Design a protein around this ligand. Structure first.
Ligand code: HEM
Ligand code: HEM
Ligand code: 12S
Ligand code: 12S
Ligand code: CL
Ligand code: CL
Ligand code: CL
Ligand code: CL
Ligand code: ZN
Ligand code: ZN
Ligand code: ZN
Lengths: 407, 411
């Protein structure tokens, strides 16, 4: 109701008033904190619409103006008549930027206002979706000098005509289970890869096979498309000191682009709204490369550095982990593909959070996600108390469509 | 109601029922999570239920629930409360209580060990001098020449809140910090304020980088008193690195015995405001936190200078490199001197096995992810990918305000 957050490294105390405008629910109760769980009608719509428009018109400093009232009237009339309503371009651009501004798990938010928004509300077919996505990918990649972007397909209507991108990211590598029993490629993508082969994809059956897009337009059955290979910028991974590192045959793609979330603005639901920024290095070197359920390369790198792997207390895992991460950052930098390291990224977020407290009265942040997955306490976010709550406009999770889709 | 937690690395799903026995509050509401906030006189009326529920837990655990002995103990405690406003725990209840507070401590990665806790009952203690003696015996027993043993010493419980026993130190063993006129700090900056108090109370400070603090001890609500732990009872480890011969020349060392002395033990409604407890270190506590926090010894720069890392840009990951070597050094030093220490890989693996075992046997294991996950190498430890549920069970360890803010000076 008037909350304080302390930074334990610096002693700075900040006060949060923004949480009073909190809308959705957290998962937590007074008896039980769910902070570390990954996923914890016309009547309904007008309140949601009003609340959003009120925040839109106050942001442009015309709250209570005729233009404010007139728009509220017009949206109200349109909902009564058509049971939905259409956002103005300005309202759409504002809402998408704020969905990012509100993303409590995103360390990269200092950038929130520089999002490029592509309005794909005129799209009608999976083929249109594919053209729109290719242009997004190329615009955002920008020869390695990456730029934030989102592409917004038509909103949900009766729930039977959803646009969806079936892929979880625009760019990801396939996964195949072997006769052997091991996994070839990225183990995270095995089920989706099976859906693609099931739908006709000719799988190359390599380690780093860029998956086809599977696109669903207007609630129709999804269709398959291959992104032009020349549009998928990749980086081979080398180490600035270890000659042998390149012989692991490792590479990653430059563009991180989340494609399976739902964007809710003023009550309306944009179920296909892929968005991309650029990588923080640990995302690849720690998660993609080192998670036991991902490419899982810690053991091989350690073996090549010739460390004493007999006992955990030599910190051989920790040594190999730092080196993999050095290689990731070095490789992206040498090829001039935008990347940020966790020190720089978290320092930036702390400056952002201070701005947001000063100018907005708050910044919802989820500590579990904001603190990098290596070297936590040496980054400034570790010691920063944070309050996690849900503001709207927002990005939300939604079920994988192959569980939902009547074929 | 059943609550499921998932592990994202293995896909194992567990079901929590234990949360149904949750009593205290989390700080969280349906609108706000306070999972990353550090900090979240009893009448007869409130006391009997709290006593009753504790004694029911105790009697269940010994398979005597509903026995004549159980019922007599309830009646006995009941009368004692209405007649004297409080009650005294049997020794077995105190032991069981103290083990449970640890079992229930959701920020503790070390809990696989909870059932091996040496409890020293110091409820007959009446003076600060008595406290000193009890604490020296704790330290010597727990140190055991490097082969560390868990232990807790329990002084008399709160009565009217005007007669509290308190250990004013935050740990039994910690190093002084001295703020200098030039703004710099000598020793441990975490302990500057407490060092000022000790000096104000009459301690002659050596003013070095690693001076062991005196104990400042309050018995029966009296003004506290200073005592020097016998130097021969303070086990220390000089820090060296297995490959880098210049590391020793940094002048680093640390004490072997981690001993938390400022918490409150609640059992069956009763409040034990002095209850120092100790185990052994996980290496990261010294190497990541005590050495590398900026508001602590802050050695990252100096170590990286010596390794001659590229310090011109954070993206060389020079900080991460110095951090690993420092932590390698801490573990190597303790092992070489035969003083118990655990690395974070080993400790988190143990905790995950503990936790699964707790789910099967107990129906839950409350855990605080923010604290359980280590401050380096988070995700290559098996706790990172483990969903946890955080809730509060009694008996428990609780925070209490520092006694210098609340103490009524007798003079
Ligand atoms: C500027 C480049 C960006 C960087 C460096 C960045 C950084 C991150 C990181 C590190 C995570 C957590 C992943 C992890 O745990 O390792 C994250 C999550 C997230 N980011 Fe950002 N981000 C950026 C751009 C964006 C943009 C443009 C949006 C939306 C427009 C966005 C919205 C989110 C959302 C919704 C999540 C959480 C996804 C989930 O809950 O699963 N990010 N981002
Ligand atoms: C046996 C060796 C032990 C190890 C390795 C161990 C490990 C830890 C670690 C790593 C933390 C978090 C400290 C940090 O890194 O910030 C912790 C916190 C805690 N531990 Fe354990 N522990 C051990 C024994 C015990 C014992 C014997 C007790 C009490 C009987 C205990 C109760 C707690 C409590 C109450 C906290 C939270 C402190 C706070 O909230 O500030 N620990 N322990
Ligand atoms: C727009 C954008 C930019 C950027 N740099 N990074 C992102 C990351 C989004 C993302 C995607 C995934 C897909 C699955 C694995 N690659 C995963 C994550 C983080 C997952 C995660 C899991 C768990 C269990 C904890 C935690 N802190 N984070 C985050 C998005
Ligand atoms: C009995 C016992 C054994 C053991 N190995 N470790 C402990 C924990 C002691 C402890 C001591 C302090 C005082 C300062 C350290 N020198 C602080 C803490 C909590 C540290 C902490 C702070 C913050 C801000 C976040 C976080 N995750 N952890 C924990 C207790
Ligand atoms: Cl990724
Ligand atoms: Cl992950
Ligand atoms: Cl410590
Ligand atoms: Cl800390
Ligand atoms: Zn992971
Ligand atoms: Zn919570
Ligand atoms: Zn710290």
């Amino acid at each position: 109701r008037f909350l304080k957050v302390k930074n334990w490294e610096t002693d700075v105390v900040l006060t949060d008033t923004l949480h009073l405008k909190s809308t959705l629910e957290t998962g937590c109760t007074e008896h039980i904190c769910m902070g570390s769980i990954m996923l914890p009608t016309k009547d309904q719509l007008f309140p949601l619409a009003k609340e959003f428009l009120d925040q839109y018109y106050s942001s442009i400093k015309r709250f209570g103006s005729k233009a404010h009232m007139d728009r509220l009237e017009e949206v109200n009339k349109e909902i009564e008549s058509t049971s939905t309503y259409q956002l103005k371009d300005t309202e759409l651009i504002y809402g998408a930027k704020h969905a990012w501004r509100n993303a409590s798990r995103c360390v990269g938010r200092i950038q929130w206002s520089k999002l490029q928004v592509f309005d794909a509300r005129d799209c009608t077919t999976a083929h249109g979706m594919f053209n729109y996505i290719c242009n997004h990918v190329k615009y955002a990649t920008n020869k390695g000098n990456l730029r934030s972007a989102i592409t917004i397909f038509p909103q949900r209507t009766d729930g039977k005509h959803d646009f969806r991108v079936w892929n979880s990211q625009l760019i990801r590598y396939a996964g195949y289970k072997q006769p052997d029993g091991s996994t070839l490629g990225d183990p995270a993508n095995v089920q989706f890869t099976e859906i693609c082969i099931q739908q006709g994809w000719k799988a190359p059956r390599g380690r780093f096979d860029v998956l086809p897009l599977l696109l669903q337009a207007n609630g129709n059955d999804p269709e398959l498309f291959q992104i032009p290979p020349e549009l998928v910028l990749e980086v081979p991974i080398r180490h600035p000191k270890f000659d042998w590192f390149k012989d692991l045959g490792l590479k990653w793609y430059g563009l991180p682009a989340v494609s399976n979330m739902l964007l809710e603005i003023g009550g309306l639901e944009f179920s296909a709204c892929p968005f991309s920024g650029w990588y923080m290095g640990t995302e690849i070197g720690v998660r993609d490369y080192c998670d036991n359920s991902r490419y899982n390369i810690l053991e091989e790198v350690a073996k090549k550095m010739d460390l004493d792997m007999r006992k955990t207390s030599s910190l051989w895992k920790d040594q190999a982990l730092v080196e993999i991460n050095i290689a990731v950052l070095y490789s992206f930098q040498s090829d001039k593909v935008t990347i940020v390291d966790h020190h720089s990224a978290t320092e930036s977020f702390i400056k952002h959070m201070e701005n947001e407290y000063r100018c907005r009265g708050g910044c919802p942040a989820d500590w579990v996600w904001i603190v990098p997955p290596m070297s936590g306490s040496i980054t400034p976010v570790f010691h920063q108390e944070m309050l996690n709550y849900r503001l709207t406009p927002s990005f939300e999770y939604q079920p994988d469509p192959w569980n939902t889709h009547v074929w």
